[PDB]
């Protein structure tokens, strides 16, 4: 369902539309008024349409029959397609000016925000569910504004990424039970190589900028990285990977994974879990906002610390959360501190654990004396 929404949502990825005309050749020609063209949502791959049951909805790409999905741009509201020119086209529509009115070319209706606002919208967020009204109000003219290539490329990257990971998740829980034994894999083959390639692309896509760079253009890469990470989290990739580690972690060892997916999928298990942890770290590294999402499931990462398949990866995720969110430290309890200390006892003398325990005490120049006392009460007197 489409809405006229305001606030920070008007810089997220969900508010991006692609003008997809009806002609393949010269599809990048200038825009002339009143010429048919679909509307495509990049992150979801759906087309604006007039449906019979729910009015103005975004319908799948498999059912856009060019009649209910075509639209036109016009300068006035008077009741009025032309013959295409095999050229760059006539340039008149501009960016930041030239207020446009979108009209469904088939039914002739006009888009306008629905007037009613119920009790839920009495004080809540002001979203005005757009309806393709028969005549509509007067101030429903729309401006047209750019989005930079980084945003458009990112948005398409989420849209491509979602289908692959959703297919992977569906394959994962398809063989959740029903052990293979000595036969073949239960369902369709997992897109292992596609996923591993996608992960390595994403991990390199979120590489932090190198230290030696000039401060003038280092920061612009910080802002680019924070923007990209926020877009991915807002589109759910940060939750999608959490689902991925959730499904992969129910199998303790690679051999145990073989009994439920096959001997062909076992050798890629350790690699795919390590890459997933690295992708999680790169997604959350440096964001207060994304790191703050681990307050509700802080025990999730802590419980997985003793796992042997990727110990440094999960420790990296923990260190990225703790070095960034001062809020998370208030949720820290003695179970977690005794788990971190158990890491020192079971995984040897790893100084990165001390780099964690230093972060647990002081965050952003403010001491947390409950953590300081718990650490000194559970670590120091043993002297071992």
């Amino acid at each position: 369902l489409v809405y006229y929404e305001g606030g920070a949502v008007c810089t997220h990825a969900r508010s991006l539309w692609r003008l997809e005309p009806l002609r393949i050749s010269w599809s990048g020609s200038h825009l002339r008024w009143g010429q048919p063209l679909r509307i495509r949502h990049v992150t979801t791959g759906r087309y604006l349409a007039l449906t019979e049951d729910q009015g103005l909805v975004v319908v799948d790409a498999c059912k856009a029959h060019t009649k209910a999905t075509s639209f036109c741009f016009r300068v006035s509201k008077e009741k009025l397609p032309k013959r295409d020119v095999e050229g760059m086209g006539p340039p008149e529509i501009k960016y930041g000016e030239s207020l446009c009115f979108v009209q469904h070319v088939a039914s002739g209706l006009w888009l306008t925000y629905a007037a009613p606002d119920p009790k839920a919208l009495r004080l809540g967020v002001l979203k005005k569910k757009a309806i393709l009204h028969q005549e509509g109000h007067m101030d429903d003219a729309l401006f047209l504004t750019r989005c930079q290539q980084e945003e458009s490329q990112a948005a398409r990257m989420i849209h491509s990424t979602a289908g692959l990971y959703n297919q992977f998740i569906k394959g994962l829980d398809s063989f959740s039970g029903k052990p293979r034994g000595s036969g073949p894999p239960a369902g369709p083959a997992l897109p292992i190589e596609a996923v591993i390639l996608s992960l390595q692309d994403l991990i390199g896509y979120f590489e932090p900028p190198s230290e030696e760079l000039q401060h003038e253009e280092k920061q612009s890469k910080l802002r680019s990285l924070r923007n990209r990470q926020s877009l991915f989290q807002e589109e759910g990739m940060l939750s999608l990977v959490l689902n991925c580690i959730d499904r992969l972690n129910v199998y303790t060892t690679a051999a145990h994974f073989a009994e439920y997916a096959g001997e062909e999928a076992a050798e890629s298990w350790k690699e795919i879990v390590n890459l997933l942890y690295e992708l999680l770290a790169s997604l959350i590294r440096g964001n207060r906002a994304n790191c703050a999402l681990f307050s509700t499931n802080l025990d999730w990462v802590v419980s997985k610390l003793d796992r042997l398949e990727a110990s440094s990866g999960i420790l990296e995720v923990l260190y990225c959360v703790l070095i960034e969110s001062p809020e998370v430290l208030n949720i820290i309890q003695e179970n977690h501190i005794k788990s971190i200390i158990s890491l020192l006892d079971k995984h040897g003398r790893n100084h990165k654990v001390l780099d964690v325990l230093c972060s647990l005490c002081v965050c952003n120049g403010v001491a947390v004396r409950s953590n300081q006392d718990l650490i000194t009460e559970n670590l120091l007197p043993g002297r071992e």
């Binding site: 208030n330 003398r349 325990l357 120049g365 403010v366 001491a367 947390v368 004396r369």
Partner: protein, 820 residues
Amino acid sequence: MDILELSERLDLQRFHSHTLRLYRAVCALGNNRVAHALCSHVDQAQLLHALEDAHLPGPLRAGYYDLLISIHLESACRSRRSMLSEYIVPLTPETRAITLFPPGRKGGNARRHGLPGVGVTTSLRPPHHFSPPCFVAALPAAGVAEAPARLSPAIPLEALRDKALRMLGEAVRDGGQHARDPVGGSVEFQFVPVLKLVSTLLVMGIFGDEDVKQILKMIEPEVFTEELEEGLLQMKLPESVKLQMCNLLEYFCDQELQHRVESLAAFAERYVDKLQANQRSRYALLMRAFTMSAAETARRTREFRSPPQEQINMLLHFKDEADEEDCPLPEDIRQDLQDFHQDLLAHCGIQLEKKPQSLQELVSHMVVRWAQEDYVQSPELVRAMFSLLHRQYDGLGELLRALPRAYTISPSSVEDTMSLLECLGQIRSLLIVQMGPQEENLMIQSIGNIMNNKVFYQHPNLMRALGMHETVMEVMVNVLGGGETKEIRFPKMVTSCCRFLCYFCRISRQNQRSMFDHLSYLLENSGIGLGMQGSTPLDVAAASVIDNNELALALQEQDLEKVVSYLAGCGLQSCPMLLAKGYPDIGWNPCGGERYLDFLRFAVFVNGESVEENANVVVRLLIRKPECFGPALRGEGGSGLLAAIEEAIRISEDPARDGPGVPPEENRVHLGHAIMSFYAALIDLLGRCAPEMHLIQAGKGEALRIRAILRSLVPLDDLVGIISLPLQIPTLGKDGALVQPKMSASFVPDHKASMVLFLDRVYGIENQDFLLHVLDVGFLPDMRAAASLDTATFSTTEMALALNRYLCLAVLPLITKCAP
């Protein structure tokens, strides 16, 4: 194994050097309960040996000096460093002897500058407190969060300061020799940790005058002569060492500034005595002036009839030489001040050869030479040196910005000032720590010791100079911000902080004005503070505007928009804290609405007269947001106010619909009483928002319009019905049991007192027939009920007192007005 083997076992070196960082972390930011514990793991002997251990690696050497500083020094140093920015100067003979320049024979306008940091300083600084680390001592019987706060573990400071000086001397000579193997592996590892230790001891004031003279010789052995061996300013140091050098010079600059302020206070000590004597003698001369004078005596007696704040203004108003006629001072006094101004400018280097000859020129040239020798890469170093350079050039301006925190006190209250500064240090130390139950009882008694401090009343300007009300306010706001959605943790502290702020407002108007400037800041944080009970954050905001016409008029309308928006939410959503206890759900929050209303009662009504601008703005906001009024007065689909009143009367009487149905919490919410009190506070607010009688007599258009709106909103008939409603009576029976109602869940006289006030101010009483119609059914049952209650038993019962106040404050003045 030998610890020196870690110069080659770098796997253990990385782990141990991180372990020391963990030791500094767990004892960081004044965790003296832990800093004592660390003294078992690393004793005093190990640290002292590691001071002189020349073969220790780099990271372990710097980790061990910084561990010494963290364990034994930093808590005392930070607290002292905070007090370095305030100059409280007691009036003592030592203060009297303080002068800008030493007694010398160089030059009359200005002698040679003294050695900075050398001399006598009388400014107040609380002493440090330490404890001897003893792990065999009996465990205190006092429970946690009640026992006194632990002090920093003790360490011999005379030995530490001498060993530190010796190490710095050896480092300076070794650096001069250009040895291929500097201590710790590099020049940075040899000089930076030691200069950190020296800087910390200077800030703590450990070093005496002789030691400070030594340090000045080490920094520059030729400029600082009082009347190889190469100083630290010629050794081609790295960037890291330069930062500590800047911290040293910034300490000597601060000591110069404090020296100036103390000299100025001494001059004020002598100058006020002479000026007071002169003005007294001139008063005696004016006593006999009438014999030889005439009507021109007004100009000369103006000074003695002018307030002291400006008597000095005219007395000192002779700088520019074109207004001497107003100044009655003799030329010897005028030359005295015009002399002290001149050498003050000289000592600040205004106006009056590779030798710097002074600290100001030394630092300014040193900074410029460093800047133009190489592109400085450290942003903290760049900031550190340019702050110094700005201070050297703008000598006067730094004194100008240091004067507002200067203050002079009488010697009779120094030991009370000490205990004030200690409790202030306790408050300031809580800005950087997440609050826990141990710190909460630390600051409740810290505040109480300010309560019981006579200087908190005798010098209210000093508290604003120390900025105590701010530091309390951020301590409040941090706790409010933490868990600002779910529930307010630590209400037992907030109820003391709010009380302290209200006490601070009531001391004077300037204190109230200063607290008033943070009004919007308190309003934004007051959204969730209504969950707790007692003294909310909002009661501070009210206390900042009670009985102040200037503040009430200067109150921005945007703040009123904020309070009405909050009231709107209180009239549209239930209270989650009330819901969590099992209370029956109603679609609005009466308690929160009331707590906003009784604030607006203080915003619109000042000293018994309504404020027109605020009253008009309030009423035109509440009409624009009709949900503020509640379920009644809703308009379309809303029943009457009276329908709501008897509805809440029945609900309040009925158990299991008034509360959760399972005071008990000593402030248990009663929804019937909360709704009734909300309406009474709304009506009483509108009554106080009604225009005054003289405006209606003048027939002002908007005054009539506003009264018309209030009349349309609240009809007179419902008012008379509520005043006609019965009141429960304390009854005697069942073997002398003086049965009384529960005033927290019942129809109280103050609800009627709000009804009467609204009826008086809006509708009034004009004609006799309507007067008696009000009297027989609205007031007379209460008059006879209170008349009957006056016996040997009920006369002291609280509800009878409530009716006594109700009659004597709401009914009887109305009847006395309507007597004709």
